[PDB]
Subunit: 254 residues, 7 copies
Amino acid sequence: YAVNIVAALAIIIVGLIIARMISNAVNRLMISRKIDATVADFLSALVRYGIIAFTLIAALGRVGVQTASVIAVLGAAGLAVGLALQGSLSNLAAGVLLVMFRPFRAGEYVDLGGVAGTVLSVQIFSTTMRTADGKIIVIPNGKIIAGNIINFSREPVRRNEFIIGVAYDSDIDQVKQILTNIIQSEDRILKDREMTVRLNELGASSINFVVRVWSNSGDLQNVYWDVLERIKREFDAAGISFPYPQMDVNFKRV
Amino acid sequence: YAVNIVAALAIIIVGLIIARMISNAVNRLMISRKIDATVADFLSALVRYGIIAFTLIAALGRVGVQTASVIAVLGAAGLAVGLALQGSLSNLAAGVLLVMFRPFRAGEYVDLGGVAGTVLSVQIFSTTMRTADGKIIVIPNGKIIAGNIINFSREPVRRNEFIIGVAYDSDIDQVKQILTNIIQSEDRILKDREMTVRLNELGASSINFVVRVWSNSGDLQNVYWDVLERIKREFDAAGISFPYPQMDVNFKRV
Amino acid sequence: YAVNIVAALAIIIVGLIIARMISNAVNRLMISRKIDATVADFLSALVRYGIIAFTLIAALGRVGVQTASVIAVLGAAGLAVGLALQGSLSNLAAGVLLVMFRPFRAGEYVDLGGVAGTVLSVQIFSTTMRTADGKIIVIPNGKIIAGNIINFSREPVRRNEFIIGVAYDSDIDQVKQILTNIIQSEDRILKDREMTVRLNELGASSINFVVRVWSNSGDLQNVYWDVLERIKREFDAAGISFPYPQMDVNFKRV
Amino acid sequence: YAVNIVAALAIIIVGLIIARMISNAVNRLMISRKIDATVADFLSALVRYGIIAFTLIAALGRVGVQTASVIAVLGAAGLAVGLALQGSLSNLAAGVLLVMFRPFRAGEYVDLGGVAGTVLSVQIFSTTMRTADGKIIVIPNGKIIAGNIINFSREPVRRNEFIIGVAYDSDIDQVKQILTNIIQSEDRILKDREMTVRLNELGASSINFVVRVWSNSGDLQNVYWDVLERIKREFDAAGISFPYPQMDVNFKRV
Amino acid sequence: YAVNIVAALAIIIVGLIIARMISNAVNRLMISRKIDATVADFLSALVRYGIIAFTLIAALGRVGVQTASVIAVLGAAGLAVGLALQGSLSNLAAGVLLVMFRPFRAGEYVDLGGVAGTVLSVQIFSTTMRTADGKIIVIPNGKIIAGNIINFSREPVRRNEFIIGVAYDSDIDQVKQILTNIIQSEDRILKDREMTVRLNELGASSINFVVRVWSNSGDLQNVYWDVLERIKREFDAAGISFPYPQMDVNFKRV
Amino acid sequence: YAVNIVAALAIIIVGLIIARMISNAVNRLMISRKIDATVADFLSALVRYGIIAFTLIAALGRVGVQTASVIAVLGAAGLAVGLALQGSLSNLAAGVLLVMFRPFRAGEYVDLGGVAGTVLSVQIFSTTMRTADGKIIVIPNGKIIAGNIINFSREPVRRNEFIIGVAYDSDIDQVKQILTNIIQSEDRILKDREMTVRLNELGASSINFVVRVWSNSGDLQNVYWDVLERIKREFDAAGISFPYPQMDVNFKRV
Amino acid sequence: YAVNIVAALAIIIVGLIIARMISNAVNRLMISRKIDATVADFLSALVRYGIIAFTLIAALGRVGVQTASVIAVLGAAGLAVGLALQGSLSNLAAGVLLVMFRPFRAGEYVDLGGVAGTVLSVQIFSTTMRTADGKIIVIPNGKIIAGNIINFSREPVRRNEFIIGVAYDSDIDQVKQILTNIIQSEDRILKDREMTVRLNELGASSINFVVRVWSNSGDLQNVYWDVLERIKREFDAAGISFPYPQMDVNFKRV
């Protein structure tokens, strides 16, 4: 009736003292194999939890009598292990596809669903990637093949999207002529591709022209800065005013 | 009692040294089959993890005695493999439906739930698609048949939705006449379909007319830019003022 | 010990060369059955992956010896296939209910949880629907019976919800009389149903009347535009001013 | 070795031609049973997919030899069917509880987690409900017993929550007296219940009184409109000003 | 070969006609047991779906021959039933814990993760709760023990959090003295507990004092209204001005 | 054929009448064991649902004949029970770790992923915690070890983060000197740790200094109030102005 | 018929009294093993719930007769235990990978998907991490390898991203010269890396220059404060004005 219960708890007691013994043993073979002062404690806790799990399945093998009282609960605690290693091993199967079917390698400035940065290394569970401002990010591989791996450095040619808000009173032909003269004077702009400068929308306080300019991927930010400084200089020189947010106030003196 | 445990750990030690041996062997047959310097290390780590899994199931086959002590935990670790390959192989089954039941092919400017761009290629796990500004995006196929695959280039005819905010004091008939004259003068607009220019809402600072204009899919952005530049020119010529955000300030001199 | 491993890897090598052979064979029977230049490569990759899976289960049938070493891992990789075809075949079972228990058919301007448009066709995995501006959207059927399928063209009669912001100094009886005269003069408004014009809330810069007007589903947008243009014309004629966003500025000259 | 594979593919070919034959047969018994021109094609595709599934399980019964090679993959593809009919049949089990344990019936203006409207009918997979502006919404029953089914017409008595922003310089006793006189003069307000008119918060541009008024569920919107029009009329008559958004501008002449 | 298929479909035909017969039979014993005109149709549809499921498992028992062709697919469709009754019966197991381990009973004004209201009754699948404005909400119990069940009426003593924005030029000692005099003059405030009136932050347009005042749970809103009306009256009497949103405008006459 | 069905339904009828009998019996032994008037009804409904489940499995044991017709559906309805007790018993396993591996005990003012308050008691399914304003919150333990359990009272020393916006025309050395004099004059500030007062950002209308001041956890809010009142007093005394939101208005008289 | 039911309930009664006995016994061996006054009650409740589960499975072993009536429901309640220990033990398997495959150790100021702080310790279920303002956060490890573990202190070199809004009338060469002189005069800036000072965008009220400056990770905030104070001082000295939010007001005197 209960003699199997009290015997099983006695086996759990000897399982705890042998958990202490094999934790010291795994620390000994850890310092025999490769020295690390803090992971030997967690390896000891892992083999301790495993051996009290083995003492647990021996315990309910002793107490349970009917036909499969140990077998069902053993496959049960194993299914707990299985759903536990769902996310921790799906990163492994994702890391298989990340290099065998590689959408990026170590060196392309990529963007892994949100954060962006050049990949330092694709490891077997993580992707250590230096972001644009030095913060090393590692990302679990089950999140990389969950979202869009938007690469940048795979295509050598990219496109700049300027938006230059000018005032309503400015002549459209003068602004389009000066903008096309600017994007024609710059030699880093690829002149074969789409160079569109036209009126994009009529916003609240201003109109604003889209200037879509293609360039190589390496000179992209340099073009985006140089053309914009050129736009500011030429628009200040040519009298085409940049507008502050306008407002039409109607007075009412009470 | 514990002699099966210490024998099982000895088998794990010979499993580690044979993991080293078969990692060198799989590197040798990798450079025999097809050369790649970095995936042979990860293939070696994969076969290493697999063979310590085989040593693990041999270990708990040695230690576990009862009826199915190896079988339940083996189906367990296999179910861990199964839930791990849930997301990594659902992309494969999605990539079956993506081409056998194809909603898009390589060349249509499409939008895969968020990001948008022409598809370069539909591979077996990803869809490499060049976005509109050169950033190559790959997307896992389990996300494509999770969201709306909103195509653009499947229908040859699309619709432009202008909104032109004009002032309250402007005559409605003059604005509607000039807008219909503009969308009638343009020949790229398909004159058979819906050409609606009517007062859409009365906003806070302005009224604004919706101009729904259909066109071919190739000339869509060119129509949206040319008609809008025409609207700005004709409204500046005809004296119909574009309004800045109005405000009715009531004074109070203390 | 390891002779089963090296024999199993040899079987994987002959599985790779017969994967090449049956990929050429499935390309041959594909061009025999129905010509498509790009799906025969992906069908070849599918039968290639299937036959290396069969070589894999033969491999661990050779290496595994105990009782069910092939059977547990075979049901495992099959359960990987099963969870992979969870989402890819739930669209099929949803597409059964979408037409057998049909909430919409090809032609009703519907809204499938977010995006909206007339359905071109309900296929067996997708619903190709032209949106209101020409973008063909296909939607996986497992998302349609996940969200609200808000139909519009099933009920022939719908309701317009005007909100007309007028100034605080305007007389309420004059605005209600002119609005009821407008919605009574229009004959496309169904005069039997709810025609409510009353003061809805007192906003910050204005008061605003709700004008709830029912109409047929086909004339709905035409009524919403014509009544609103009538409201603008009659309110400009009757002197009831439309207010810009007011503000009460208290001065303080330092 | 491979003779079972090529024989299995031959059986798949006769399964395809008998899929065509039984698709014509199910179309024939469909026009014998009940005529519908488009669902017979999808019923034909369903029985076609089912019979190639039966040919598939016969195929891997032929090729697989060991002990349970057909049985594990058959329970696998069945588990794919099971997880596919997870969401498609949970709506059925929800529709059981929706009427056996009914929180609403056809006629109460209810709100099913987001969208709101009177229920036209509670079907076995959906709840066709007319919203307040004519758009017929059907909602899958697995979403109704996922969220709060906030009923309105179950309780006959509801409460109006007015917020009337008045200026800071207004006398509090005059506003409270006029508001209580208004909510006492109206006879549709239930005088037994909570009639609270007190200063609720001191906002940025104004103070604002909460007027909590109970009424019957049928006269609720009529009370909310009539009392608010009464508030506007009496506050314009009594000189208690309604404030526009105030601002305290401190000058600085450079 | 196919004689089992055509015999199985014949059994499905007699299953459909006996589904009609037992639907009439369950309607007869429903009007024998307890009368309800609309749930007998859905009970008839439920027993109809169950008996075509039994005809289906008899059908694939006839067609499937090998070893467990009926057993695997029967446990499969049962697992479909099981995952279907996941959410529909987890509400039952939550409703066990909701009353055996009760965090609230019928009468405490509680807040069940979002919406808030006094509980009318805790049923076995739902919690009918009247919200503060009469809308009866029922909530599935699997959502209550998913989120925070933030009770209010379990603790008899609660705390009011006033924030009174006053101008920068006001003396801090005068405001703190008048506020402490107000919260000392009110007798419904519990004088033993935390009565903190101090400067909380320096906002953009004003400074604002936090007045944390404890009271009984029944008099909480009455204290929050009475103390605030007292604050408005005493601050208008004592000359401490309430500030409108300030702004420091620097002129520039072009 | 159907005699097992009608006999099974007869057994369901005697299961319903014995469900009534054992519901009265469990009410009798409930008032024998421990009196509670409302949970005996729900315990009666629970044992009623359990015994109609036993009558159901006896029913499909009678009707089902083949090999495991009762066994598969019994493990099925049990798996429904299992997924039902997923969330209702994961709180138990979380409550094990919450006290055996305790990150907080009854008395530390903690924050359990969102809401914050001192823990009154950690029960076996919930954590009754009084929030800072008296609202007793209970939280299911499966949500506590889902989110960050951000403790406050575990570390005795915390840090105040002042932000004091001053005008652009103010001298930086005077503000830094007065702020360091204030945070040096206060003795509750721990003078050993980080006392940083430097210019943090240049906002739109003002500059603003961060004043990071460490203190004990008990005196934290008292320091944050006293230092801020000291800042207001000393800045009003020293002529360093606090700025309202500035604006640079450029006139245009039409 | 029912004698097994009443005998099973009698066994549940002796299971309750032996639950009391073994709860006292586990309290006795708890004070024998290691003293803790409150976890012995919860350990007693855990062994109480376990032993009524054993009495429950003995009860339905007595009542259920057919073939596997105890076995299916026992694997069922065990699967309830398994899905309960899904989330509570996935933290363990995540904590294995967190230290064996370590992306951070105790001491690096890291950011675990949202909240950020230096890790005090990585325990076996949680990561106690002191945030930047003293609030000790523990985080379950199943959430760490769900999101991006964005480290900061792994890379020794990071980057500051200044944005300095200056007025439109300011000369671009003067601002770029003064900014480069400032970031060249500071010696803590790493002069080898990217020192970009160029015009970044033309905002509404101002233009604004990005100043991207790299530095060591320890001096990062000190550089960000010192360079910004230098920017304020040098821009006030050199006459380059900092702009308040501009506005272009057009008058209209009614």
